[PDB]
């Protein structure tokens, strides 16, 4: 059929545009481009990943995109796919992840009597349809240009080539119920759009006592490298002057440089809201955040005058040392192993070149409390909406894409490690992400570390964790589950081991099966007291 | 003086209880703490039964089960962000099955939308046209002078949510998105500084009383014309059609005692069809409903009427019948029904290997009156209809809305909990009625996390899940090889009793008194299924 | 002071700090708090307020006020059909990238679904047509949170302005700013003045968004035989000024080598440089649909047009090498002379007066510094056919969707905003002229735009030339102008130039009878003469 | 092909009680069938230049005697111009059928209308012309039922 020629042209243009991975699920109707994707997979031009669970498939695609920075397609095949992909599409929108959602509508069928929800109108960068492929035998040159131009538009919108705001894209290729026209020479994309430079310099005086708060999506800024910096784990670091998050309330910054989108630490929110502290927002795309409407100016880079006062740098470094010491000393003086102990052990075990995947809740916070040095490390976390859903498949896709990048450099060395640190509720939410068929790509160096305190530890640290709610907070916030994690991994044929926090390090230096789950049992009944002891030791 | 979030949550929870809500599913979060606190106290005082789950998606199907088990509206309460998005699949199913599901989502204040605030998304309107209504409560204001007026607006909006979900005025029940923006303080103030919840109407009545509506649309039908009835999901009960030959899907309520096997329909020539509810299961029904020659009369309980037939001469709610079926027609239909039943019975016995059709037949023969049968929406529902189950006296549930694989375990669990709950309230000292679920291995593995019930949460008292495990176009490469998951290992991970048994023991094991919740795994073969179905067709 | 007044006054002050000089208001009870704060700023001279009855025509007035000088413009109306009436102007503002802020007053969202009067689903009505749908939080009685509410109110307003002006996206367009308002809606007694919570010092906006630059350079070899096609929204490119250029009347001209659109089908360029969004000429669309000629697309916003399928590359500027071959330049110049002569000679030979004659007369009478406003259908085409030289004059047309809606109000708004910027340079010269060319059908359809209350600002030098070919109704144009008390005259095409040379008598309508029965024969003579 | 689609739908609308149709001049077949039906006296056609006024004319034609009325959009400014009339018809429960034709937008349609039904492309194939007849008339009957509130009591 002429629609097969269409599918082969689109898959080819997608591959020319940098797509190396596509996720599919089996469905009622044939997947969009399902056979052209089958052809491309057997040739090794693209790599296919199949899953039954459409929600975990969406989050696998997110992992495959953030693992190495490439656009990733997901092929919708059912009337439950839109609903199940919603979570991943929302996360793609807010974390600016280039996610292409492929659909195949049927224009000859009656409508008003793909099960559509309301989020496509709000979450996607673009919604493009290809139009019905006809058998026009002479217009093949024109239809090739039309299909490839539309595919280049889909890729440009998903990667933010013109907007500098990557995100999810809905790509519809309509199908009527049932020799490839060539592309540009040298495998180039049909419509070349050079990745745009989006520039907006801001004047900032660094002699004013300044702290840098960098969050998810922050850029790298060499002219700010000397400033004291509270950097979230997923922020790429510019300098060598880290400021511990717990030291921040011991200081009085006179101005704040906010890089990207911060979401962690109530002390950071308090400082960003303080109407007496000017906040300069520096972002990489057009979006910029505002805490209590306190943002004074926006920009993409700083034009700096002056330099930080040496006494200011000394004050920040002193408060930083007190914070590091309090955390280390109170961890040692605490008998029960908690999630914070696990995060410190994981943090000490990382090596340059590693990839770190962090779940929401305490893990992404605990790693910052443990003072992880992220330089040389690639840190991922679904900070767009901070969901605890889909983190297992995100780590798997990230491990697969990160390994594929290393394999393509032809290095004879072993694939770099991907270490994931997630909580137990996070693991239970997306345990079905462990179900990978033998026919499907499986990571070769993925270790999932599950810090298991049989519930949600973070709620012990919030207002609902105050002792006056002790008789009611167990069911509705603690949420104990008593799941046998080792038996769960066994059911899915995944290597699993329960180890103690002191064994965690050594067990991680040892290579193992391509995919394994290390579970560390932790306590959350003493979490609130441990954090109070840290604050008192500051 | 209670803080505004606490006052609003307690009023809303109280009005939901007054509206018939007996069960609430809660998923943990911080932003929904006001709702969580108010719900925990209502559960402590016995006004509702709270079910806590970790995975919002399967929690939504738990709520569907809790609603179809006894017909009541059910709320599911979750925090802001992707937690709300995870309710999508259950919302879609609740829409098409007309299930009164209330998605009670906490939110950040709407003014934070667009600011980059953590865990904030376009929640209101997320579900689009799938919901019967998207209703937002206002952000609660600290205005003790306006407390009485705010009580009236909060309770009135809650009643509109309930009415829209139950179809109290539209006769078209379905899901409703109830979004509640909430700001700090989120936890109740110290009880020294305490106050009473702004009161509702006296005598536990709803703020706005909507008497359940009667929706009537009479239709004239002459039964002297050779007529077959095809009843699907949502079909009504029609005593004046009880004598007609009736092809009834397992979930359809039976109007009479004149069944007609689905395999018999293509071998007969009805001159007119009466279609009840939303029938989608059988292919010859779909083939015959596509026949432009046969006049089709559609009778629905609500204003939605199915589009399966293109020659629907008329659509109503009841039949005003004239005439009577010619006795030779009834004899021909009855004769062909017995012929179909015998062909299935013989070919099943003549088939050597145990198949899913054999497990479905064994479960059918083990059912007694008063049982609840929950069927996976894929093969189980078709196999039970092929094995000719008599559904009179048993309640049959199936997520026939979109017939997805998601949430079948949680639906079975929820249906069992609501079914047993209604039996308690009868005060009967009789033991809790049995719920039997029949699902395939791939469905069981997909929603195995639906088995996760926390140690403090309600567990069904008499639920048995029978898993027919047969270990099962480039997307279909995943089925060529077996998934290879151990059902027993999955049940141990979720601390669920499981046994691997054979089809001949299935009957007796099901007769054993209920050990709470258990999984009975019966191995089967799919390789020979194509030959078994071919043998049945040739025997007709 | 009631919170709905303090909220309205903070928003208006921040809008003013953000460059809003003109606001269009429609009467209603729900937008009363905005109306009072807007009348206050109009009294003190901070903005110029314009009141209209019809909200649809009010939207096109704000579009004219926006395109006349390039500033963001708000339109404030009441709840109900008023917002739905802004639909047509929001669609036009979207596709033409016009910074139009729709400031809608609404009953509290809690009243949605309760059967309240004049209450509808307003938030999200415009859907995908707006760059942002932002809502302010319902003003609460909390003086202890006044400073907090100030910051959030002024940050939201700055976010509204940035989205409308494309300050960080380079994609200007309409924004929905919905304000839920409850009673009391009028200002309480304000003896000895009330303190509005202040903005930043020195009139600076709350959040400072410095100028942004989107850069996407493309390598283009000018030695290849190149034609430039510039449409609506095109930027200015010095390094392309030597190339043959087919420029729509609204396109800013970068050079001095014009190529008539009629000459383009006489040429075979080897590559095309396309600027902005060209939609006007059929030979342009034919060339762009030729998948054998490579097209380079140079745009100012991230939106790049799709009229071409052989789009090789899209960017913002060209890095050029080489120079156009002299034989290519000579051939294009010769084809251009062919086209211009064919149009001029055949117009001079035609015995009747057609719309093409009216358009050519209006072109001849234009002087540098003039503003020309064109009805987006036939007038834009006829002026392009007549060969109008647009250098030194600012040409405006609702080229977004090219509807007949609101052309009169757009010309009125463009004239006012254009004259206002001429008063801003302190120059003692008389107000520069605004000449509008519209067809009779367009004029009757938007004749209600002529309704301007005695107190509202009236243009000082606006002349609307109506080309009346009785269809493009039997309505009397002069009778329409008398109902609205606007000066009108029926004149001949020979009298057009001299009558336009008279100093502007405020607002006047010049009606020129034209024939359309002989049009097809005039066009055939032009095509045959090429 | 598409011409036959237009005749069947027009005929079914008249069978459903539509006695008046408002259309506005524009580019966007169906106008031909309505023209045949007007020349034959089965339906009364009303033409207006202003699309907003056309919507309010149709509202009047519907509330004048209680019948369903159709309005035929034909341009890219039609959806926005019919907005005010559609909102009025929503809240006043007026049976207003809005006829469009896309080639295989604002957010108000998703909030204001009782239903949104697309007929589907007309495939040249007289082997199933009887089934295409039933599918078109069935969907047209669904549109009339949704507009008049025949099953919901909510015109
Ligand atoms: C999809 C989703 N549902 C609910 C939440 C609310 N939430 C935030 S943290 C948390 C607990 C997570 O527990 P766990 O993974 O065990 O981590 P811990 O904090 O105990 O280390 C929950 C439910 C969320 N972020 N995302
Ligand atoms: O900088 C980023 O990466 C970023 C990402 C986002 O999704 C935002 C959403 C709203 C507001 C600001 C945002 C932002 O600054
Ligand atoms: O009775 C009616 O005619 C009527 C009509 C409407 O459009 C309503 C809209 C919202 C709420 C109540 C409504 C109502 O009672
Ligand atoms: Cl040439
Ligand atoms: Mg935990």
UniProtKB/Swiss-Prot annotation, chain A:
Gene3D superfamilies: 3.40.50.970, TPP-binding domain. It comes from Mycobacterium tuberculosis (strain ATCC 25618 / H37Rv). Keywords: Magnesium, Manganese, Menaquinone biosynthesis, Metal-binding, Thiamine pyrophosphate, Transferase. Pathway: Quinol/quinone metabolism; 1,4-dihydroxy-2-naphthoate biosynthesis; 1,4-dihydroxy-2-naphthoate from chorismate: step 2/7; Quinol/quinone metabolism; menaquinone biosynthesis. Its EC number is 2.2.1.9. NCBIfam families: menD. One of its GO terms (biological process) is menaquinone biosynthetic process. It catalyses: isochorismate + 2-oxoglutarate + H(+) = 5-enolpyruvoyl-6-hydroxy-2-succinyl-cyclohex-3-ene-1-carboxylate + CO2. GO terms for molecular function: 2-succinyl-5-enolpyruvyl-6-hydroxy-3-cyclohexene-1-carboxylic-acid synthase activity; magnesium ion binding; manganese ion binding; thiamine pyrophosphate binding. InterPro entries: MenaQ_synth_MenD, THDP-binding, Thiamin_PyroP_enz_TPP-bd_dom. Its cofactor is Mg(2+); Mn(2+); thiamine diphosphate. This is 2-succinyl-5-enolpyruvyl-6-hydroxy-3-cyclohexene-1-carboxylate synthase. One of its GO terms (cellular component) is plasma membrane. Binds 1 thiamine pyrophosphate per subunit. Homodimer. Catalyzes the thiamine diphosphate-dependent decarboxylation of 2-oxoglutarate and the subsequent addition of the resulting succinic semialdehyde-thiamine pyrophosphate anion to isochorismate to yield 2-succinyl-5-enolpyruvyl-6-hydroxy-3-cyclohexene-1-carboxylate (SEPHCHC). The lineage of its organism: Bacteria, Bacillati, Actinomycetota, Actinomycetes, Mycobacteriales. It is an enzyme of class 2 (transferase). Belongs to the TPP enzyme family. MenD subfamily. Was identified as a high-confidence drug target.
């Amino acid at each position: 059929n002429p629609s097969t020629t269409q599918a082969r042209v689109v898959v080819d243009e997608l591959i020319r545009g940098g797509v190396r991975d596509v996720v599919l699920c089996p469905g009622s109707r044939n997947a969009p481009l399902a056979f052209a994707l089958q052809d491309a997979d057997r040739s090794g031009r693209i790599r296919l990943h199949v899953r039954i669970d459409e929600r975990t498939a969406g989050y696998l695609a997110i992992g495959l995109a953030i693992g190495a920075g490439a656009p990733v397609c997901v092929a919708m095949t059912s009337g439950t796919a839109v609903a199940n992909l919603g979570p991943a599409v929302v996360e793609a929108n807010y974390a600016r992840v280039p996610l292409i959602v492929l659909s195949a509508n049927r224009p000859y069928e009656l409508l008003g009597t793909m099960e559509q929800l309301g989020y496509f109108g709000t979450q996607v960068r673009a919604s493009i349809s290809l139009g019905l492929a006809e058998d026009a035998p002479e217009r093949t040159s024109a239809l090739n240009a039309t299909w490839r131009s539309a595919t280049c538009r889909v890729l440009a919108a998903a990667t933010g080539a013109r907007t500098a705001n990557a995100g999810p894209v809905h790509f519809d290729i309509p199908l009527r119920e049932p020799v490839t026209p060539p592309g540009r020479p040298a495998g180039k994309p049909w419509t070349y759009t050079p990745p745009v430079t989006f520039d907006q310099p801001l004047d900032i005086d660094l002699s004013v006592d300044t702290v840098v708060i960098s969050g998810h999506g922050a850029g790298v800024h060499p002219n700010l490298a000397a400033l004291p910096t509270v950097a979230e784990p997923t922020a790429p670091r510019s300098g060598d002057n880290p400021l511990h998050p717990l030291a921040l309330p011991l200081l009085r910054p006179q101005q704040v440089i906010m890089l990207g989108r911060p979401t962690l630490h109530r002390p950071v929110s308090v400082l960003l809201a303080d109407a007496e502290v000017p906040v300069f927002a520096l972002t990489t795309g057009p979006r910029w955040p505002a805490v209590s409407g306190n943002s004074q100016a926006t920009g993409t880079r700083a034009v700096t005058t002056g330099a930080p006062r040496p006494a200011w740098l000394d004050r920040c470094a002193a408060m930083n040392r007190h914070a590091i010491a309090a955390v280390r000393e109170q961890l040692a003086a605490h008998p029960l192993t908690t999630g914070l102990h696990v995060a410190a052990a994981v943090s000490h075990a990382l090596r340059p070149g590693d990839q770190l995947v962090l779940g929401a809740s305490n893990p992404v916070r605990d790693v910052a409390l443990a003072g992880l040095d992220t330089r040389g490390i690639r840190v991922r976390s679904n900070r767009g909406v901070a969901g605890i859903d889909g983190t297992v498949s995100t780590a798997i896709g990230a491990a697969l894409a990160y390994e594929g990048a290393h394999e393509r450099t032809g290095s004879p060395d072993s694939p770099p490690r991907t270490i994931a640190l997630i909580g137990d509720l996070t693991f239970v939410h997306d345990s079905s992400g462990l179900l990978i068929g033998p026919t499907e790509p499986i990571p070769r160096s993925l270790t999932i570390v599950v810090s298991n305190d049989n519930g949600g530890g973070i709620f012990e640290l919030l207002e609902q964790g105050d002792p006056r709610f002790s008789d009611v907070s167990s069911r509705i916030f603690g949420t104990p589950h008593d799941v046998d994690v080792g038996a769960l991994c066994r059911a899915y044929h995944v290597e699993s081991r329960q180890i103690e926090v002191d064994e965690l390090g050594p067990t991680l230096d040892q290579p193992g099966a391509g995919m394994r789950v290390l579970e560390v049992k932790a306590d959350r009944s003493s979490l609130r007291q441990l954090h109070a002891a840290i604050k008192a030791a500051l």
